[PDB]
Each structure stands twice: as C-alpha cells, then as structure tokens.
C-alpha cells in the first residue's frame with residue numbers, strides 16, 4: 001500500500017484503485033485521493049469528491065496529474081457507470097487543477113472561480129472552461145453555476161490562496177473546505193507561499209458560517225473531520241494576523 005509522507009493513511013473503508021484511493025463518505029458521496037511522489041521525501045496525498053446526483057455524477061477537484069484524473073474517471077465508470085456532468089476545481093494549484101486536460105478530453109464541463117482561471121497561466125495550470133463569480137458575502141452568483149444540483153459553492157475570502165473556494169454538498173451533512181481547512185489536530189497551515197495571512201482566519205470562519213450545519217468537513221490533505229477542523233484552522237490563522 002501507499003503510505004504517504006503527508007496526508008492521511010489508508011484505513012478500513014478505503015478502496016485502492018490503480019494509483020488512487022476511494023472512500024465512500026455517504027450513499028452518494030465518495031472521496032478521491034491521489035498522490036504526488038516527491039524524490040527523497042515521499043508521497044503527498046490530496047483529496048477531492050465525487051457526488052452522485054440522480055443519473056449523473058459531479059466532481060470536486062482534479063487529481064495532481066492528468067493520468068491520475070483519467071483514473072478517477074475510470075473508477076466512476078466502473079463503480080457508478082453514470083456520466084460526469086461537470087467538475088468544480090477549488091483553486092489554481094497542482095493538487096486541485098493538475099488534471100484539467102483529462103477532464104476536457106473526456107468532454108466534461110469545468111468550472112472554477114474566475115480568479116482561478118485568470119491565475120491559472122502563472123500557476124502552470126490549464127483554466128477551467130467556465131468561470132464562477134461571487135457576491136460580496138461570498139455566495140456564488142447562481143447564473144454562473146448552472147445545474148449544479150447539490151453543489152453549493154462559497155468563496156470564503158482569501159486564505160490559503162486568494163482564489164480558494166469551498167463547496168457544501170446539499171442534502172448531506174458534508175462540506176468541502178479544500179486546502180483552506182486543516183484537520184483538528186494539524187500542526188500547521190501547510191504551504192503559505194501564496195496565502196493571505198491577514199485574512200485567513202476570517203476566511204476559515206466564514207466557511208464555517210456558510211455551512212453551519214455541516215458536521216463532516218472534508219479537506220485536501222487529511223481525512224474527513226468534525227467542525228473542530230474549522231475552529232482549529234482559524235485558531236492557527238489567528239497567530240498569523
């Protein structure tokens with residue numbers, strides 16, 4: 001098995017498929033995990049989501065690479081056998097957008113914050129084909145997120161990056177914080193190279209206020225946790241201000 005240097009380990013309830021791991025979180029929600037192997041350091045896990053909405057599937061975040069992302073699509077084909085309607089990617093970094101070309105080759109409509117699409121070239125990413133825009137309180141403008149089904153997109157403010165977005169899964173108790181949120185036992189806020197340290201704490205708390213009844217918080221680099229992930233992330237961020 002893959003024992004990542006960074007990220008959660010494989011545990012009971014996990015399915016290894018090719019180079020990836022899949023974990024069912026709810027009847028209609030699965031977490032995908034892919035790994036970036038760093039020489040002399042080891043693997044770094046990154047998580048995203050797969051949501052079934054009736055006769056179609058929705059994806060949140062790519063894997064690190066196009067091949068890993070094509071493996072996500074193969075898992076969906078084998079395990080669900082329904083078409084992927086769209087994907088939402090949560091900021092312009094490799095772990096979240098590294099596999100855009102695989103989604104495009106498959107003919108899947110891709111969405112990201114307009115700012116993620118604008119930053120994508122400098123970040124070495126391929127932009128999504130559609131841009132999401134947001135209100136002054138962070139909620140997505142609904143005309144920019146057509147037919148998103150249960151995905152409720154929220155821009156919490158600058159934090160891990162200035163473009164980071166989050167997604168609540170309506171009809172469930174799950175919300176996805178991406179790379180903004182760290183687990184309740186995390187020791188750091190991860191890579192702060194592109195972060196807004198002044199606004200981070202407020203952005204983390206805004207995510208919690210946007211999805212006040214979500215009890216399962218999913219994030220990029222740890223296993224799903226309680227709402228203490230939000231509070232602990234904000235407390236660590238209070239130290240940067």
Ligand SMILES: Cc1ccc(-c2cccc(S(N)(=O)=O)c2-c2nn[nH]n2)cc1
Nearest residue numbers: 006044093094095160179189190191221
């Ligand atoms: C403990 C830890 C976890 C993850 C990383 C990481 C590794 C590679 C790439 C990124 S990103 N999205 O490019 O900035 C990150 C990261 N840091 N915080 N969120 N994601 C580093 C340390």
Ligand SMILES: [Zn+2]
Nearest residue numbers: 091093160179
């Ligand atoms: Zn990032």
Ligand SMILES: [Zn+2]
Nearest residue numbers: 093095179220
């Ligand atoms: Zn990350």
